[PDB]
RNA sequence: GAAGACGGUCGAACUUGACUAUCUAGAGGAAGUAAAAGUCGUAACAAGGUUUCCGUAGGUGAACCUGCGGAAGGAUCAUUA
RNA sequence: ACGGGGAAUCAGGGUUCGAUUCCGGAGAGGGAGCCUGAGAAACGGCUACCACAUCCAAGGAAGGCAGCAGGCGCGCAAAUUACCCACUCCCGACCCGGGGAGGUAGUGACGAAAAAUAACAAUACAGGACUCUUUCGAGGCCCUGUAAUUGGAAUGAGUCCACUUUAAAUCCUUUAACGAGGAUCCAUUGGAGGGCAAGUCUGGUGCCAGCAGCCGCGGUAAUUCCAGCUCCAAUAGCGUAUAUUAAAGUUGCUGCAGUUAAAAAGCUCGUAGUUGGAUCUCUCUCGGCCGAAGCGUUUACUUUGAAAAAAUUAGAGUGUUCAAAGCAGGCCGCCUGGAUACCGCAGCUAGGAAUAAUGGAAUAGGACCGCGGUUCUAUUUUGUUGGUUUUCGGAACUGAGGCCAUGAUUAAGAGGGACGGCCGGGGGCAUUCGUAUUGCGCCGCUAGAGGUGAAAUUCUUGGACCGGCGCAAGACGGACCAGAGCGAAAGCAUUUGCCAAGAAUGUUUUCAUUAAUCAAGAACGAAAGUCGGAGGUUCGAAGACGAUCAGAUACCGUCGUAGUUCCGACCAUAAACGAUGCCGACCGGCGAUGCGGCGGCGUUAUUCCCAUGACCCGCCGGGCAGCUUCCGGGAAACCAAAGUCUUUGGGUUCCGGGGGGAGUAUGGUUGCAAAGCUGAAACUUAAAGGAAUUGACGGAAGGGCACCACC
């Protein structure tokens, strides 16, 4: 880790690593291009 | 317990309670001071003058007769040495250890015994520089000491 | 003997803070090298994802098979073998399940019979094991 | 070397109440010893003592009663405010009924019960019971 | 009296070097760890069948062995004019 | 790590937390620059750049929730896109407008306070207790219930009109009406082997499943698992995990340890640090005798004062219906309260003067006096007015004289240094002697000799071993040699000389605190080993042989390189040990011993005398030791120190904190190297260990016995 700035940097990469991987599958559904947002509704 | 020895030895002088000059002593204080001036013009230390008056002239304590002690008599008349009595005898002793040491290099006894005589010199030079009996730049250098004594 | 002067507080205050370092309870909580080695990072619980059900053997004078679970932690990727406590409690768990894991109770040391196991499962699939064991709830799929 | 003459002159008279003697010799004496010994004598712990005058530093011969359990010195002489005397006489004394702490105030070497009346702090010298 | 320019200053930032530090794909081998109740002697604890232990140098399948110098934590608190 | 006020715990000392509503700082995605203004380097302002990112008709345009809500992500981990300016206050031109400041609700077992889940009566008991009966047994006299026996009386929780509350509502308070008999309007969470309250009851399982913080439980009778019953603890709460505090005298200032359990540096010197022996009983120029002004050498200490935000903490008053709270209230318009303490260190102030530091004159350019000189110079004096000159005033500097009771505390059973006679296997250099071993020369008589538990490797008429005379080479200094001596420790024994040190003793010498312990830094350091020369007698790591052996790469025997010896460099370690830091005081005996001093009968020698030696009997001082003891310690073994220790504090250095990993890895440094110094963590364990006891075992001894032993 080593010395407060290469720890704050080391957090920023792994924060950027996770925050960009969660976006690579968000556009799988319901964009403006729009495969339509299928909502099934059932009553119990 | 002695400083640079492991011996805890008890041997000294025991001064009596009665502080007065005794009855038989027929020397006044001026006569004792006149004796001291001659015994110092002979070239004796203050530690040797007090012995000669005790053994031969019957004076028990010169501080008890004259009211003053030996060194404050000589330093007031003027016949006193610059470096004091015990610092002389350590410097003169550390010369003869150092002079003998260049003859016999392998003697690791007197090489150790020189440092004890060395380390006693700086304990006294510090004290005399504090009480201002020595000038505050006097230092024992191992090469000049043949001309200090 | 100890120093005992009246101007000796710097000798006293600084002898102690070097002598404090030979205390292993002091050192393990102040050096920082055993909190980057802890799999949690100083949390009471953590969550993970079950890799497999490895069951590990009891230690010397008593024999059984302690059923454990190999967990891979979410927040730092580390791996962990945690112990599934009661009986029939491995039968509420499948693979690739999300498990809240605790410590075992000895603060990062193993608890007697089980070798090298410092954690125990608390909840599986966001329901409690005490709720499943005692039949209060149903395993959600 | 002899740091603290009052320390060696109290463990001389501590070690002889153990061994059952009736007199101690305590050389050398300062005048803090004679003030401390006079406080113990006035509370009946010691009895009469005699100061032998050689020209150097006196010795004291102290006649002992058999009444002293413990005689002690505090080192260093910590400063004691009067609002902090209760902690000292709870750490050092056996009860609230007997035993004294000797402290050197600017009104004289005294007890803790005298120093409370004259409203004085000082430095703790020692204790006896 | 607007645009615009010269020069100064403040200074974000860019480019390339050096020192690093960290996130990242890869055969090879490396050490310790989880056990092991697996095989050959039996180094040690009895004078443990070469009393043992310490330092230091050398040689081995290995516990070790041997040369030098200690210690008793020895198996003697002692050996006769 | 934003800092404080503070918070948790706590005997006393302490330890840890303090993002968080009060004060102070900073910052609005990251740096940077500005405009305006009293105030900003402002972000609910602007301009850039780096990073993200919205619309777009592709030319352009606009961004900044660490405000209130809300969303995603992150995670063990945290509430509503609600109502209102009515309260507390703020802004504006303003009695009027505005305020996600703030207030009110909603969610909320964070947490803290109060507090239901039943009470009572009559029967009956093969229940207990009180009075009598010897006892059976006699009673509303007091209690109890595994009576799901009977019986009314009481009530909330709910359901619910109304009032009250509020901005408007809710909630609580107040009231209608309904509202309890398995009062099903049922109380839970952990446990029942010990720590630790409470079942070796019953069924099941059979070292499995599992329990268990720890010890342990489970292999067919489980006090421990899975359950049923019963019992226990807390109780609208109770388990678990982790942080932390006490327990922990297991961090020790109070208050620990260091011979053998973890641990005193190999020894000594030494700067800083820390600690240091006795001693010493308020006055001048002014104002109305009472105040100014000065002090005296400077402080530490102690006591008082004044200044120290509120809230919190402590604490006073007050029936919130009690309480946690609150700062209110009380009396028949009045009477109240809204106290007070605490608030370390540092800084102000005033009194004390013990303790502790420090000054004050020693070649007197010292105090106090009046005497004279030199230089500068005040501002009043001459009715004002220009000029001169004094006086005094105030300084600064020199020369005599008087006077001071003129001025040095003692000499530590502290230390240094003299001096005196001794003493010692202390050290160095030079010299000297001894027997032995090995080799060599010669002679003698001869076939064996060496070594072993036995042999064997080995030397022999190219004459071994043995007896004799010599020569040399290097090594080593016996017996005398002791629980004796010296040395800082390693360490040191033949004679003689030389050189320079030392302890102890003796002293009516000397200096007069110069001292103790010690970071840094330094000297010496057995053995072994590494660079260079010299020498190699014995012995000899490695190596080669022979034997013992199941096996020997060891023990045993024969050779034998480096080494063992001398000198110049390095290395700096040992069971370098008393496994015991140094200085200091106090504390029992006894007999010896070594060195020095003092006193004394009487024996020897120097011919008798003195003196000295040798003894004999004591005394004193310091040494290495010994025996002894209910001094006291200690877990004991044991220790006159390892004592003077919960009755705990004489000074001071080093150093230990369960066992392993490990004195390892890494980094630095030292070294020719060998290695030396310094020195972890991951993980792993519930014990490792010290003394002592009783057996058992011994190829340890002493004794004893048996034809189930031998002879």
UniProtKB/Swiss-Prot annotation, chain A:
Localization of this protein: Nucleus, Nucleolus
Domain of life: Eukaryota
Signal peptide residues on this chain, from the entry's feature table: none
Ranges of Basic and acidic residues composition bias in the record: 1-9
Family per similarity comment: Belongs to the TRAFAC class translation factor GTPase superfamily. Bms1-like GTPase family. TSR1 subfamily.
Purpose of the protein: Required during maturation of the 40S ribosomal subunit in the nucleolus.
The name this protein goes by in its record: Pre-rRNA-processing protein TSR1 homolog
The gene coding this protein: TSR1
Residues shown, of full length: 47 to 90 of 804
From Swiss-Prot, chain B:
Highest rank taxon of the organism: Eukaryota
Keywords: Acetylation, Cytoplasm, Isopeptide bond, Nucleus, Phosphoprotein, Ribonucleoprotein, Ribosomal protein, Ubl conjugation
Residues recorded as bearing N6-succinyllysine in the entry: 26, 33
Processing after translation: Ubiquitinated at Lys-26 by RNF14 and RNF25 in response to ribosome collisions (ribosome stalling).
Modified residues annotated as N6-acetyllysine in this record: 26
Entry-linked SUPFAM superfamilies: S15/NS1 RNA-binding domain (SSF47060)
Sites of Phosphotyrosine modification: 37
GO biological process, one term: negative regulation of RNA splicing
Entry GO CC: cytoplasm; cytosol; cytosolic ribosome; cytosolic small ribosomal subunit; extracellular exosome; focal adhesion; membrane; nucleolus
Residues annotated with Phosphoserine modification: 29
CDD domains, A to Z: Ribosomal_S15p_S13e
Record's keyword annotation contains Repressor: no
Cross-link annotation Glycyl lysine isopeptide (Lys-Gly) (interchain with G-Cter in ubiquitin), location: 26
Gene3D superfamilies reported for this sequence: 4.10.860.130, S15/NS1, RNA-binding
Cross-link Glycyl lysine isopeptide (Lys-Gly) (interchain with G-Cter in SUMO2) mapped to chain: 42
Principal localisation: cytoplasm
GO molecular function terms noted in the UniProt entry: mRNA 5'-UTR binding; mRNA binding; RNA binding; small ribosomal subunit rRNA binding; structural constituent of ribosome
Subcellular location, record wording: Cytoplasm; Nucleus, Nucleolus
Assembly with partners or alone: Component of the small ribosomal subunit. Part of the small subunit (SSU) processome, composed of more than 70 proteins and the RNA chaperone small nucleolar RNA (snoRNA) U3.
Family of this protein: Belongs to the universal ribosomal protein uS15 family.
Protein name: Small ribosomal subunit protein uS15
Swiss-Prot record, chain C:
Superkingdom of source: Eukaryota
Chain positions with 3-hydroxyproline modification: 61
SUPFAM superfamilies: Nucleic acid-binding proteins
Compartments where found: Cytoplasm, Cytosol; Cytoplasm; Rough endoplasmic reticulum; Nucleus, Nucleolus
Keywords: Acetylation, Cytoplasm, Deafness, Disease variant, Dwarfism, Endoplasmic reticulum, Hydroxylation, Isopeptide bond, Nucleus, Ribonucleoprotein, Ribosomal protein, Ubl conjugation
Entry GO terms, CC: cytoplasm; cytosol; cytosolic ribosome; cytosolic small ribosomal subunit; endoplasmic reticulum; membrane; nucleolus; nucleoplasm
Cross-link Glycyl lysine isopeptide (Lys-Gly) (interchain with G-Cter in SUMO2), sequence positions: 36
Residues bearing PTM N6-succinyllysine: 53
Residues carrying N6-acetyllysine: 134
PTM info: Hydroxylation at Pro-61 affects translation termination efficiency.
InterPro entries: NA-bd_OB-fold (IPR012340), Ribosomal_uS12 (IPR006032), Ribosomal_uS12_euk/arc (IPR005680)
GO MF terms held by the record: RNA binding; structural constituent of ribosome
Primary localisation category: cytoplasm
Region feature Disordered, mapped onto this chain: 1-25
Bias (Basic residues) ranges: 1-19
Subunit structure, as described in the record: Component of the 40S small ribosomal subunit. Part of the small subunit (SSU) processome, composed of more than 70 proteins and the RNA chaperone small nucleolar RNA (snoRNA) U3.
Involvement in disease: Brachycephaly, trichomegaly, and developmental delay: An autosomal dominant developmental disorder characterized by brachycephaly, ciliary trichomegaly, dysmorphic features of the face and hands, hearing loss, and developmental delay with short stature. Intellectual disability and autism spectrum disorder may be present in some patients.
Family: Belongs to the universal ribosomal protein uS12 family.
Origin species: Homo sapiens (Human)
Swiss-Prot record, chain D:
Alphabetical GO biological process terms: cytoplasmic translation; positive regulation of cell cycle; positive regulation of cell population proliferation; response to virus; ribosomal small subunit biogenesis; translation
MF term (GO), any: RNA binding
GO CC annotation, single: nucleolus
Subcellular localization(s) per the UniProt record: Cytoplasm; Nucleus, Nucleolus
Signal peptide as annotated in the record: none
PROSITE patterns: RIBOSOMAL_S8 (PS00053)
Keyword Cytoplasm appears in the UniProt entry: yes
Keywords for this protein: Cytoplasm, Diamond-Blackfan anemia, Nucleus, Ribonucleoprotein, Ribosomal protein
Top-level taxon: Eukaryota
SUPFAM superfamilies in UniProt: Ribosomal protein S8
Annotated disease: Diamond-Blackfan anemia 20: A form of Diamond-Blackfan anemia, a congenital non-regenerative hypoplastic anemia that usually presents early in infancy. Diamond-Blackfan anemia is characterized by a moderate to severe macrocytic anemia, erythroblastopenia, and an increased risk of malignancy. 30 to 40% of Diamond-Blackfan anemia patients present with short stature and congenital anomalies, the most frequent being craniofacial (Pierre-Robin syndrome and cleft palate), thumb and urogenital anomalies. DBA20 inheritance is autosomal dominant.
Quaternary context: Component of the 40S ribosomal subunit. Part of the small subunit (SSU) processome, composed of more than 70 proteins and the RNA chaperone small nucleolar RNA (snoRNA) U3.
Family: Belongs to the universal ribosomal protein uS8 family.
Name of this chain's protein: Small ribosomal subunit protein uS8
